[PDB]
Design a protein around this ligand. Sequence first.
Ligand SMILES: [Ca+2]
Lengths: 347, 174
Amino acid sequence: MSPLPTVENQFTPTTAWSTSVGSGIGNFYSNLHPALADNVVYAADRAGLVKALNADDGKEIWSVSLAEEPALLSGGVTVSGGHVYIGSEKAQVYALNTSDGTVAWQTKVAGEALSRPVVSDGLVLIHTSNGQLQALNEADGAVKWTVNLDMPSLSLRGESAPTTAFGAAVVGGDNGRVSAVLMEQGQMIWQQRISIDRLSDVDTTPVVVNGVVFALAYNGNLTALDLRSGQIMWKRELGSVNDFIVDGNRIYLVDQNDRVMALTIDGGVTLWTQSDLLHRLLTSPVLYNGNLVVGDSEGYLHWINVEDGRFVAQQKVDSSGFQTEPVAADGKLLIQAKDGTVYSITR
Amino acid sequence: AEIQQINIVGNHAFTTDELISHFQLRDEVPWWNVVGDRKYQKQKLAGDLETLRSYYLDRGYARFNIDSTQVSLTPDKKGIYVTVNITEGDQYKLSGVEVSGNLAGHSAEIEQLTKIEPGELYNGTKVTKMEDDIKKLLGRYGYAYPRVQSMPEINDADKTVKLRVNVDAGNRFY
Ligand SMILES: [Ca+2]
């Protein structure tokens, strides 16, 4: 991989707290990451342990075990409306109560539930490794509808979490197509192709802004689609499995070779590229106090200025390394290392 | 790239661990075999699916089905995931065996090869060996290439299977 660049920090980022969460995910590549809601962090490990932690000091509020298989906890954590949602590779979806971690409900779904659960319109959206998109009722977990998506012969481990807008879910497929489905009854609305060198997963979360859907497939392309019809407005030959950011009139992405880039929202023209972290296996990016932040497999956080793609800081945080997505919300920056340790980072 | 996990979904009668223990593909090399690796091969996967199929068929699960399988690569291209999605169904008992076709006048001996223990579970391998017994029996009268096909007639109400076996003795050879 690319060696570590020498950076003179413009500020000194530090760790506000860290808290272990069992043994994390280790080398099992998956989505599992922390959630934050009302000053509580919810985080899990693959084996089945789930904790709620005070967001200010990382001290434990409750801790439960969903094993007592291992559970193979994998998709999530997502929190909404008093519920903590987690999908597993034993094809289970759990809804835990935020107050005490009791299981409100648990549902057997169609396949390994790899995706970050997405909550919208009273439903919980789950995307399985065998190509099913399912909507579960928030109140009892009953499956309301299922959409079959075509699976190629080989794909990339992971499943697209849909975005939602105007009563539709917009989801990436493993065969290079983006699909829009009505959330009332899972009615297919439109499907548009945007795609080992034949690998073409849209594992990224689509982003919907001003009647436009932005989606990104592995091996290309980054495409803008008309939300109403699915028609392609423009495309850029860029590829990734990492979520990207649309903020202001900018697109920020980390491509499949770990180039970090900023593009214009109107046409996807590149503003800058930062290639120094090439093949260090970056997490997807997050905006924190003005800056782009990514983690790498060696356990560094890199802070990047959005105007010019310049490093403003770097910090050595965790030896087991990073993989799953960082989270920035309510004044916090959170990230979970492969060994399960959750960090709250302060700028 | 090396196999990170071989996962089975839908297996309630037997643990994932017990099932994949019988596979050529490995997500883990056991200490007692040195030669083994975690490399993926298409042909091995195909063999393992047949092993899994036979595992259930031999144990009464006449409706056993492999709904789908996924193979996927991790984005760093170093890891492989294998997932097998199955519907077990219930266990089935053997009601009878009916034999028909060109039996070359050895119906009686053949019928005594297709006897059923009372209350016997369907066993896929036992069906194959019964077919083989019929082929060898015909082989002892000159018929060097007999063909035998067994079609399970499944009764989901009774939880019973009737075997309809077709035999074609074929040419006699000197
Ligand atoms: Ca995928």
